[PDB]
Design a protein around this ligand. Structure first.
Ligand code: ADP
Ligand code: ADP
Ligand code: ADP
Ligand code: ZN
Ligand code: ZN
Ligand code: ZN
Lengths: 409, 395, 409
């Protein structure tokens, strides 16, 4: 059995999949939902989420793994996919769950089967009554063709749980076991930042050794320390808080930008496809400034000897974008309106890129230097809660006589 | 019954299929449609069938295999009730290899002078087999573009006539409020608001029309209007340079809607093609300034520069470099880059000066295109004549 | 039925294939002809030429396309080729026509079948009584092994028809239809430069719409304008005339060179194989000068702002050859007798190449500047006729008191 109680710490994902649940329950009543792509680190509850979606609508669950499809002989995988959809159509309504989708997605051996999969996605119309759920641990290798309309057009991220999420997951797993009264799961949630649901289940199961010898806090602590011997250290919590806080500050103070999301020491999220948009010079300057917020805050607070690697992913994108401004979009007066080479031109390009990056970085550093005290306050609140809202950020900054731009999603 | 009266917003496609209609009408004395879903492909096929007053044999490619596992019998029945049209929806879907072989062997084998024709509908043309487009095999293809303001207004009228909406409502505002919609989208919108009125009336009102429009829009939840303005200005710069060309080929109708021959050329023609490719960005900078230029010109900026290279390294059109065409020493690459920059900056200054000269008629054209989402080269020429500027009447 | 009347505009190709026709008619009487390779743009009449060769000798015609050979399973194509030659030997005498040969030619999937083809070419001796004809639209990708002796050793180009060729093709196609008296096909031929036979047939068939509504000149013109909406424009005719005229002038005035061919605004022809020859420094200088004639004439007549892209193909070869003179044949005193690197050597090579090219280009420009009036006369004649003979060129230039070298093939 898999019910709503078995999932915890992701109300947004539940709200997003309620529509698919209604689709599985009553296909007629709706007057699309075709493919749902779940992505996240291993052990975050993707297969659990699929099983829960299946059990909520009270429909069958057809589970399969791509790993056994690919590694076969010519014709095995394509016939396997075809026969799968045959079973699904015969046993309609149901969910077809394909674990490790990106590993298989990545003419040739693997390609023919994936083509069969896409032909199946396109063949079943919305009156067949079926849906397909796919889970992946490595999304960067996925083929963009899988994200086209009518073919896994909807994507969902399963972030790691914060204090509340970890507490709820602990409560969920505890039900089967008869723990002691003295235990305080809240302290456990506050003492295991950066853990996944499977990781915490491993803690509850780990205390099985203590029950074997004798569940009390002694076992929970011994098992958390054993697995640790990867909880996020408090210094790492502070660093991540300052990074996300710089991001939020730059997003809020930008002259013109898009809505800002909820702050959290948990990762923000990737897996790009067609942006299908256009941007101007100032908008790109501002996006760069945003991507440079975390590192600027790090340097301002800890100094030049404190900057961290957490901005890696960030630091890349920013610089990457800068290149697209000079070598692809001709947004440089020095270089000129030329898009694509002799060493002189590459030198000019690099000089302009460094100019842009250093300008925006000095700008971000000055911004942070101006509003250091409310930033410290926000960091304290985020540390105590591990997750705050854009509105709470605005409130903390208003407490210092600083009126920020009112743009929250 | 389905005739052209049921179809609206595609006069060009009607002109193109008039020939097939006449062929179906008179066999003795005497096709692949592609576009996004819900644009009216099956409707267009049914309309051609009803216009020629001939049977309509509908089938879906997805259903071929298990139904034909035959094509022979399908075409035999089509020939029996000839003249007629054999419509195959979901053509791309067409075990499948053998069936597709049979289908193409029939297309080439059947000397379909019995009076029958074959129409196929597809949503993704990139996945269609090119072999299907051989002579006698879907020799001509047709695209169904999305309706503009006027097109959406007409389609709204088409479906609205049957149900009699409220008196106060005026569809023109609706057409102006639904950019990027298809015909099926408008059908679902009208039917949804009538159903909502039933749930509430039997006379469907603007409030309900909005109740459904806001619902569909929320489903979309969006291109900002500023993006519309930017696309308008870009396409307008393109149209201005192409229409104002010293020497050029014909220019097509301008449009902000998503898009998704000469044998040999001379130096000036290539300069002019570059100038055309640089029009959008020049207009962007002139209007919004150096801090407003956008990424929409990306592809364009590529082609332009690309062409410049072909002018220096392949066609020897540089006096400094000389008549040498193509490992190369750094000095030669430096000379090439310097000449390319010279050409590009020269043509860009030229384009900027041109735009600076004619900014007011450009603003007027942008306004008209924004309100209409699509104007004709002739309308462009008229707007520019309204300011005492007489352009060459070449469309 | 396919007869001699169905082919028009290529008397040279007919003269070349008369031998193969005699071979098909009487195999005994001859006291080799093995493979004939036809190459040209699509719609020029390659398959029509093969069918005509088959019908003239009154022998069977075994038509097949390589496209259906390649895309099969292992063994399909090789057995297909083998069984083809089995049918040909059983049904001897006949022609084995393989359309789209280069597409298939281009161990591995495709290679095994091509090997079978070559083994068949080598296996049937001249007493089997069979021949093989191959047609291709893209010859640049063809494997040189296919052009070896006894294996498609003879090659033929099907050029586009000029005024006379287009007129004759129009007459040929007209027979089936009952056109009006007012029509003048000569004007059509003069008004459709750069068209192929299939293109013109499309014009005659296009007038079918006018016959449906009501064939008169109105329909022919409406259909030519429709298809155009690619006839060569008159300015393009002038440019091509001047290009070919510069070529002919440089070929005729060269101190030592090979015979010059007939001038025509139609393309000259490619598909290289073993040259099996040797050349000297002066001969290569002269070949370069020839390849630079068209562009020199273009600049002299229209100025530096008139040079065109028609010389593209030409401009490449010339420069390419120049490189072979310095980096492969040691024909540079500055560089020295070294054949194959530090940047200095590459710089020296490039400087010598530019020296050679600019020298020969100034030479060609001076030559043209000397004889501009007879060149204009020749261009006028070529424009009016679209094709002149080397002898007519010599006559036009003699009319101005200029005696050219008497070397015409
Ligand atoms: N958010 C969560 N809430 C409750 N349990 C979870 C959660 N995430 C993971 N688990 C537990 O972890 C285990 C592995 O779940 P699974 O979905 O297979 O991991 P993944 O989807 O990351 O590969 C399950 O037994 C489940 O009980
Ligand atoms: N251009 C149009 N004008 C009027 N109605 C249209 C148009 N396009 C689509 N429709 C409506 O949308 C519905 C779907 O049409 P259809 O052609 O079957 O969709 P598709 O061709 O995308 O499969 C029809 O009921 C039709 O009335
Ligand atoms: N030189 C020509 N003379 C007469 N008809 C021609 C000529 N070239 C092409 N055609 C016409 O064009 C059509 C296509 O001929 P085909 O040989 O198949 O083209 P290709 O060989 O270029 O692929 C034929 O129906 C033929 O009547
Ligand atoms: Zn970050
Ligand atoms: Zn553009
Ligand atoms: Zn040439």
């Amino acid at each position: 059995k898999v019910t709503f109680k078995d999932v915890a710490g992701i109300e947004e994902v539940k709200e997003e999949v309620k529509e698919i649940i209604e689709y599985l329950k009553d296909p007629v009543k709706f007057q699309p939902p075709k493919g749902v792509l779940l992505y996240g680190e291993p052990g975050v509850g993707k297969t659990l989420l699929a099983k829960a979606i299946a059990g909520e609508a009270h429909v069958p669950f057809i589970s399969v793994s791509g790993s056994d499809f690919v590694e076969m002989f010519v014709g095995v995988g394509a016939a396997r996919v075809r026969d799968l959809f045959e079973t699904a159509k015969k046993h309609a309504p149901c969910i077809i769950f394909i674990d490790e989708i990106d590993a298989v997605g990545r003419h040739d051996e693997r390609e023919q089967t994936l083509n069969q999969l896409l032909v199946e996605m396109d063949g079943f119309d919305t009156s067949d009554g079926i849906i397909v759920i796919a889970a992946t641990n490595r999304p960067d290798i996925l083929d963009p063709a899988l994200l086209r309309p009518g073919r896994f057009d909807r994507q969902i991220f399963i972030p790691k749980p914060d204090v509340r999420g970890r507490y709820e997951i602990l409560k969920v797993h505890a039900r089967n076991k008869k723990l002691a009264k003295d235990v305080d799961l809240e302290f456990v949630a506050r003492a295991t930042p950066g853990f996944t649901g499977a990781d915490l289940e491993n803690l509850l199961n780990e205390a099985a050794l203590l029950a074997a010898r004798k569940i009390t806090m002694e076992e929970i602590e011994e098992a958390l320390d054993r697995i640790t011997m990867m909880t996020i250290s408090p210094k790492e919590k502070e660093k991540i808080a300052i990074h996300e806080a710089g991001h939020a500050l730059m997003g809020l103070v930008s002259d013109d930008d898009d809505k800002v999301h909820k702050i959290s020491i948990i990762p923000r999220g990737q897996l790009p496809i067609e942006d299908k948009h256009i941007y101007d010079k100032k908008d790109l300057y501002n996006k760069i400034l945003v991507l440079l917020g975390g590192r600027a805050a790090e340097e301002v607070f800890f100094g030049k000897d404190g900057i961290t690697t957490g901005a890696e992913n960030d630091l890349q994108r920013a610089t990457d974008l800068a290149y697209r401004m000079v070598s692809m979009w001709g947004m440089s007066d020095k270089v000129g309106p030329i898009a694509i080479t002799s060493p002189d031109l590459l030198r000019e390009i690099d000089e302009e890129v460094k100019r842009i990056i250093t300008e925006q970085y000095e700008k971000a550093k000055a911004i942070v230097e101006e509003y250091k005290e409310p930033l410290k306050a926000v960091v304290k609140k985020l540390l105590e809660k591990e997750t705050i809202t854009c509105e709470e950020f605005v409130e903390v900054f208003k407490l210092y006589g600083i009126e920020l731009k009112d743009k929250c999603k």
